[PDB]
Amino acid sequence: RINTIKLWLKKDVKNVWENLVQLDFFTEKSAVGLRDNATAAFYASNYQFQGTMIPFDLRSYQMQIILQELRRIIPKSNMYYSWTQL
Amino acid sequence: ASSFLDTFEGYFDQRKIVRTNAKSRHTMSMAPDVTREEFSLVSNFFNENFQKRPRQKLFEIQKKMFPQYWFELTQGFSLLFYGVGSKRNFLEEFAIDYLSPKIAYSQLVNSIPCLILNGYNPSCNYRDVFKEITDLLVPAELTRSETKYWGNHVILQIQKMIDFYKNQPLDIKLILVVHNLDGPSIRKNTFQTMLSFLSVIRQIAIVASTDHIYAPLLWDNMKAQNYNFVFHDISNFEPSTVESTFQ
Amino acid sequence: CLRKRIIEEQITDCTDDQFQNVAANFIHLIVQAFHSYTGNDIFALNDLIDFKWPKYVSRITKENIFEPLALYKSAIKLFLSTDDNLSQTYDLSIISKYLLIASYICSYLEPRYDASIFSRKTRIIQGRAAYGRRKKKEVNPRYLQPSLFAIERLLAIFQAIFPIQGKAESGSLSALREESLMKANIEVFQNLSELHTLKLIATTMNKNIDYLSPKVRWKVNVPWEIIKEISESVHFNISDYFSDIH
Amino acid sequence: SLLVKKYCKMTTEEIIRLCNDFELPREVAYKIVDEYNINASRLVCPWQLVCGLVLNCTFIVFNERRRKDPRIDHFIVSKMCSLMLTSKVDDVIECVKLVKELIIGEKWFRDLQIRYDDFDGIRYDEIIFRKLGSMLQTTNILVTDDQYNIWKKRIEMDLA
Amino acid sequence: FADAQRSHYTVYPSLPQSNKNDKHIPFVKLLSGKESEVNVEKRWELYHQLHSHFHDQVDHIIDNIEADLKAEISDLLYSETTQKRRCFNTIFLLGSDSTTKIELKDESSRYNVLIELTPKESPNVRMMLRRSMYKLYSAADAEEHNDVSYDLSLVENFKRLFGKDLAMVFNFKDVDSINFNTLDNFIILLKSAFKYDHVKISLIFNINTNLSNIEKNLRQSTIRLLKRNYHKLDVSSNKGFKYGNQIFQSFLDTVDGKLNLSDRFVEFILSKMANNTNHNLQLLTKMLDYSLMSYFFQNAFSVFIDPVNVDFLNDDYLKILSRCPTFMFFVEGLIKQHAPADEILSLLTNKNRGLEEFFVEFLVRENPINGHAKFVARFLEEELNITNFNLIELYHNLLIGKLDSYLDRWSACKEYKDRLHFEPIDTIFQELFTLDNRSGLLTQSIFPSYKSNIEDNLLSWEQVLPSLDKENYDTLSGDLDKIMAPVLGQLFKLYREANMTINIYDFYIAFRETLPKEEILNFIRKDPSNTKLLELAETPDAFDKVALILFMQAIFAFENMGLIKFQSTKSYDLVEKCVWRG
């Protein structure tokens, strides 16, 4: 459409993607969060996950908020506010 | 039908699309289905009359390598057998009538004994086998300072055994034989790890029968280094009638 | 490293006010860089400080303190490139290098859209090829969780790609019996078994794994960059097979 | 040339000629003829197929003279290189190995291999010990006794 | 029970009385009895002698290089002096086949106990912690002579039980094949004990693939501090040709002056040196032992290298050595060098005295090629001072004569390349004292084209068939084997010629039309044995149904070989292929 802009290499995303997953905005597709009692916590540390074995970048994630929520939520004055709508 | 038959192009050729109205939805029930008794009868009839003479002759040709076999065994090289056809009535006559008497006389007494290991069994476990090891070799047990936190017994025993026999007389005391190493309950990594951390021994070493095309991936490089099959090829085109008992 | 550098440079114009001052503006630079990277944390900043501090020490000097802008220019680079890990990549055999290269193809390529490019034989008996991809794809399955396959597909494709061996002569009998094309030895089976334990292939993750079944599906667990770093080193090319579709 | 030519036609006696140029028997020729008239249907060029055919008739029946005379294999390939008018020849190499890929397993081919005993050009009672796993396998680097028995006469009269 | 019904059972061998035979060894009278049994004894003893002899340096060097890595790991493991005092020493064996053991130096004012961790005993975090603490306490107790549980408290509580300080060392045995999550959890747990100012530790990764393969597989949280204080090694069996060349040179010195090798064999081995970098010398030594086993099996002139046995030079040996064709080259070269013929009659088999005289005369020689390769290696390591070089490559380039063109790769010996160029030419009597695999046996028993060698048989089935004609009558199948191809290969042909997928009924009959009806019945007419089958054959479709019999057991056999993945459970009426030829 046109001070300038810099984009952030895959190494630069590798770090902060996990700062994201550790702040409860994303989760995993067929995820189950925290077992209630003992024997479930026990079997959990016995059987691992596909996500544990498959690599970092292709395990099927999930989302917490939907767009239009954020669309209404944000300060709409942003340079990116044009980009908050499907 | 197509152009290429035996190559990656032969594979691209034969693996493409067909029509569904081109589907001859036909069955073996469009043909006689009859008892399995006379089935096996006539199978065994051809296996006892169809290719008998030449099978005998080629068997007699396949013999003179027993000296070569023993000689490679002598330096402790555990052995392979691949090729097509059943591979039981070769080895069971190899070992008994050649190895133990000959090495018994050369060691100079009692003949060197053996067990046998039907791998093709669906109930083939490993712990009974280590039991019989301890029955025959009769090695030494372990302390309580080394079985580290439920560390598996047979393996640490065998790390103790391999060092006890590290400088003993360079002789022979037994042999074990295997059959259908890639059998159902035997092709598991536990059993294979056992018989790969086993055959560093000079007192024993193994003759090995095999049948599968994809057997040879089942092993690792560390294993093959430890295990050192000598790849001999022996194909016979034999009916394998008595293995027709499990499947 | 202060006390180091002050006398590696051997310059007697100093005071600890300015020591804290240069540390300060250095950290202004640190954070003015990587606030974008992290935000409002300390731990990883301390880590990366400890790592990349010393290179910046190595750059600072008299001119560099009298004007720390050019100093920052003279140490801008890690601000631009954290690079915090550590020519070559492998001291390996060749089939391990070249076989892995194939499986990335045999789970990111349609089994049907390959017979056009992965053939070299001169036809003899009557029969047609297909048309290839009439239609472009728009999503680049690089982004995708890949597919499955049986192994024979790899047996085939690897032979097809394989670097040339078995050198002939055009002699009266040289190429008559040579059959100058690698075949299914044992070494590949075993240099393959090595790989599942190196866990750069994956299969159906399984306790009581059995490599040997008819039913088993296989896969890889690697990215693009792994398979890229092989190529220009061994001087192979497959980037053209992927570079065209999306 | 003969194989760039697309969709050519042949007869019984055309290839009887191209096979009878080696004075081969007529039975082998009739076999190639049967091969043709059944499987001359899906073709691109029959010069290739019949070329490869009669070559793998020659290499199988002419192993004796070649086993003692390696001066043959150049003369023979030169003959069929110019009978079909080419200076390039590796196509002919393909002409042989492809038919061998094709015709590999028919009972009549089998009958010929038991008759004239090539098996890649080597005997059975040797190769099986070559390949089963042996050292008794006789790679005849050494020479046979009758050889020397007759080579001695050449230096007997060395005086002259 | 019948015999083989069971599993892991045992049977005892009986013996004959005795054989009173000193020929209780494998080695054989070659030459149709024209060897001596005493010569056989010579060969036997000598083999075991020289075998054990080279095995001296086997054990020497396998220990030598292991002592070398042990020295270097302990050199680079201790005294690596930190300054922050809040990091531990991390180490990288880039690509080591991680199965060796390493030592622990004491350094009083410390106790030192290793930690070893495999995939198996580390499914979760807590367990491998319990392993660690059990090892540590049961190790440091008995060395000084109540119970504490198994926890991280104990390590920071080490001072106030035993009084001494401690330094740990951690060996993640198979670093690659493990849960990286559990690993991450563990190492985050383990960083929780650098706040007591009285302990140190260190970790090593015994790596097999690469760092950049996995240093971004694990979370960079872990990896930052792991950028702090690390170390790096190239790690393999064959480090720098520093000991492989020695094995080559020692095997040259051990049987020097007697034997030599082709360009084919040397290049074959130069190839297979690289097909497994980690395990490389084991297998060359293995196959070399095979080579000598084969040699001292097959060469009846084995007994001619111990010069004591020169007295036993028999006439038959003298006959066969005459057919050295190179000796004929020499003969005729002198025929045309000299019109008279006096020395040749002086020396030749027409008087065997001069022959055997020449035998020992040309037998004694140096074979200066091998000593040349030796003092060439010398020339390198004294002037070029190199170790990063094979000697086998140089052997090969000399056997060609591109030796000059290969040292041209270094090009610093160039003022002496010409004088060091060994004009590589054939000797006399090279046919019995040299080695190469023209025979074609190595690759048949070491590196087989596995299923190629299978299908070459499955397809031919006359490479093994007894190709006989006369004793047809006595055997039942004399009229049938000749005319009926067996089941298997005919099936395999239909199997390959078909498409990917295959039906059963139409495919069955497609095969089944390859058959004789009256003649296979005639085969069944020949046996009067099975009376059930007598009645069975008297109907015409007996042919069809016995075709089905053979069909069924054949495919049943084909299945467990890995040929088919029997498709359509609940339907069991058509199939798919997976194995191809070639």
Domain boundaries, chain B: 51-247
Residues C178, C138: contact at Cβ < 8 Å? no
CA nearest neighbour of D79 among D14, D18, D31: D18
Chains with at least 3 CB pairs less than 8 angstroms from chain D: B, C, E
Chains with at least 3 CB pairs less than 8 angstroms from chain E: A, B, C, D
Chain A hits for E123, Cβ within 8 Å: 45-46
CA C2 centroid distance within chain: 38
Rounded Cα–Cα distance for residues E47 and E296 (Å): 7
**How buried is residue C199: exposed, middle or buried, by Cβ count under 10 Å (0-12/13-18/19+)?**
buried
CB contact under 8 A, C85 and E177: no
The amino acid sitting at B35 is: T
Residues D58, D112: contact at Cβ < 8 Å? no
| DSSP H/E element including B175 | strand B175-179
CA E282 centroid distance within chain: 7
The CA–CA distances, whole Å, from C235 to C164, C227, C228, D89, E163 equal 13, 12, 11, 32, 61
Residues A67, A80: contact at Cβ < 8 Å? no
> Among A13, A45, A49, A52, which would you mutate to test the E interface (most chain E Cβ atoms within 10 Å of its Cβ)?
A45
Nearest-CB residue to C223 (from A50, A53, A57): A57
Rounded Cα–Cα distance for residues A49 and E263 (Å): 54
Residues C97, C230: contact at Cβ < 8 Å? yes
* CA-based nearest residue in chain E for residue A16: E220
Rounded Cα–Cα distance for residues B31 and E503 (Å): 14
Rounded Cα–Cα distance for residues D122 and D119 (Å): 5
CB contact under 8 A, E181 and A45: no
Tell me phi and psi for residue C32, to 5 degrees.
-60, -20
Rounded Cα–Cα distance for residues B77 and B91 (Å): 16
Rounded Cα–Cα distance for residues B228 and E430 (Å): 32
Q: C172 in contact with D at a CB cutoff of 8 Å?
A: yes
CA nearest neighbour of E92 among E7, E197, E209: E209
- The strand ranges marked E within B58-166 are 114-118
CB contact under 8 A, D133 and B64: no
DSSP E31-57: TTTTS-HHHHHHHHHHHHHHHHHHHHH
**Who's near E251: CB < 8 A, 6+ residues apart?**
E54, E288
Q: D39 in contact with E at a CB cutoff of 8 Å?
A: no
Q: D146 in contact with E at a CB cutoff of 8 Å?
A: no
| DSSP H/E element including A68 | helix A67-73
| DSSP H/E element including B63 | none
Tell me phi and psi for residue E111, to 5 degrees.
-115, 145
CB contact under 8 A, D90 and C124: no
Chain B hits for D41, Cβ within 8 Å: none
CB contact under 8 A, E221 and C44: yes
Tell me phi and psi for residue E371, to 5 degrees.
-60, -25
Residue E285 token pair: 């030594």
Residue C14 token pair: 């100093």
The CA–CA distances, whole Å, from E422 to B182, B222, E269, E506 equal 52, 40, 22, 69
Rounded Cα–Cα distance for residues C154 and C109 (Å): 12
- The strand ranges marked E within E2-138 are 10-11, 89-94, 111-117
Residues E450, C185: contact at Cβ < 8 Å? yes
Which 8-state DSSP code applies to residue B207? B
List all residues of chain C from 31 to 50 with a beta carbon under 8 Å from chain E. 44, 47-48, 50
C-alpha R_g of chain D: 20
Rounded Cα–Cα distance for residues E409 and E405 (Å): 7
DSSP B135-163: HHT------SSSS-SS--HHHHHHHHHHH
The amino acid sitting at D50 is: V
Q: E124 in contact with B at a CB cutoff of 8 Å?
A: no
Rounded Cα–Cα distance for residues D148 and E318 (Å): 13
Place of tokens 């190492």: E187
Q: C129 in contact with B at a CB cutoff of 8 Å?
A: no
Residues E139, E113: contact at Cβ < 8 Å? yes
Residues C105, C231: contact at Cβ < 8 Å? no
CB contact under 8 A, A53 and C205: yes
CA nearest neighbour of E163 among E136, E148, E141: E141
Residues E553, B43: contact at Cβ < 8 Å? yes
CA nearest neighbour of D139 among E19, E264, B26, B84: E264
Rounded Cα–Cα distance for residues B148 and B109 (Å): 40
Rounded Cα–Cα distance for residues B230 and B222 (Å): 16
CA dihedral over E563, E569, E572, E576, signed as positive or negative: negative
Residue D10 token pair: 């042949």
Residue E577 token pair: 């292929």
Report chain C's terminal Cα–Cα distance, integer Å: 51
Which 8-state DSSP code applies to residue D123? -
Rounded Cα–Cα distance for residues E567 and E573 (Å): 8
Nearest-CB residue to C121 (from B4, B215, B221): B4
PDB experimental method: cryo-EM
Tell me the three-class secondary structure of chain C, residue by residue.
CHHHHHHHCCCCCCCHHHHHHHHHHHHHHHHHHHCCCCCCCCHHHHHHHHHHHHHHHCCCCHHHHHCHHHHHHHCHHHHHCCCCCCCCCCCCCHHHHHHHHHHCCCCCCCCCCCCCCCCCCCCCCCCCCCCCCCCCCCCCHHHCCCCCCCCHHHHHHHHHHCCCCCCCCCCCCHHHHCCCCCCCCCHHHHHHHHHHHHCCEEECCCCCCCCCCCCCCEEECCCHHHHHHHHHHHCCCCHHHHCCCC
Place of tokens 């990587």: C34
Rounded Cα–Cα distance for residues E507 and E574 (Å): 10
Q: What angle do helix axes E487-497 and E450-460 make, rounded to 10 degrees?
A: 110
> Among B62, B73, B80, B207, which would you mutate to test the D interface (most chain D Cβ atoms within 10 Å of its Cβ)?
B62
Coil/strand/helix, residue E421? coil
Q: What angle do helix axes D145-156 and E325-337 make, rounded to 10 degrees?
A: 10
Which 8-state DSSP code applies to residue E119? S
Greatest CA separation found in chain A? 60
Nearest-CB residue to D44 (from C124, C173, C176): C124
CA nearest neighbour of E539 among B43, B50, B34: B34
Count of H helices and E strands in chain E?
A: 24, 9
CA dihedral over E259, E260, E264, E266, signed as positive or negative: positive
Residue E290 token pair: 């095979």
Rounded Cα–Cα distance for residues B239 and C4 (Å): 83
Q: D116 in contact with E at a CB cutoff of 8 Å?
A: no
Q: A30 in contact with E at a CB cutoff of 8 Å?
A: no
Tell me phi and psi for residue E104, to 5 degrees.
-135, 120
The amino acid sitting at E493 is: K
Resolution (angstroms) stands at 4.4
Nearest-CB residue to D42 (from C126, C173, C177): C126
Place of tokens 């190629």: E452
Coil/strand/helix, residue E516? coil
Rounded Cα–Cα distance for residues B77 and B80 (Å): 10
**Who's near E287: CB < 8 A, 6+ residues apart?**
E269, E442, E446
Residues B239, B43: contact at Cβ < 8 Å? yes
Rounded Cα–Cα distance for residues D7 and C213 (Å): 47
Q: Provide the CB-side half-sphere exposure for E480 (13 A, CA).
A: 26
CA C33 centroid distance within chain: 27
Residue E20 token pair: 């009173």
CA dihedral over B127, B133, B134, B135, signed as positive or negative: positive
Residue E501 token pair: 């997928």
Q: B117 in contact with E at a CB cutoff of 8 Å?
A: yes
Rounded Cα–Cα distance for residues E157 and E193 (Å): 11
> Long-range CB contacts (< 8 A, 24+ apart) of E23-27?
E24/B102, E24/B105, E24/B106, E25/B106, E26/B67, E26/B68, E26/B70, E26/B71, E26/B74, E26/E297, E27/B67, E27/B71, E27/E296, E27/E297
Rounded Cα–Cα distance for residues E91 and B119 (Å): 43
C-alpha R_g of chain E: 35
Residues E433, E258: contact at Cβ < 8 Å? yes
Which residues make beta-bridge pairs with C201? Answer: C220
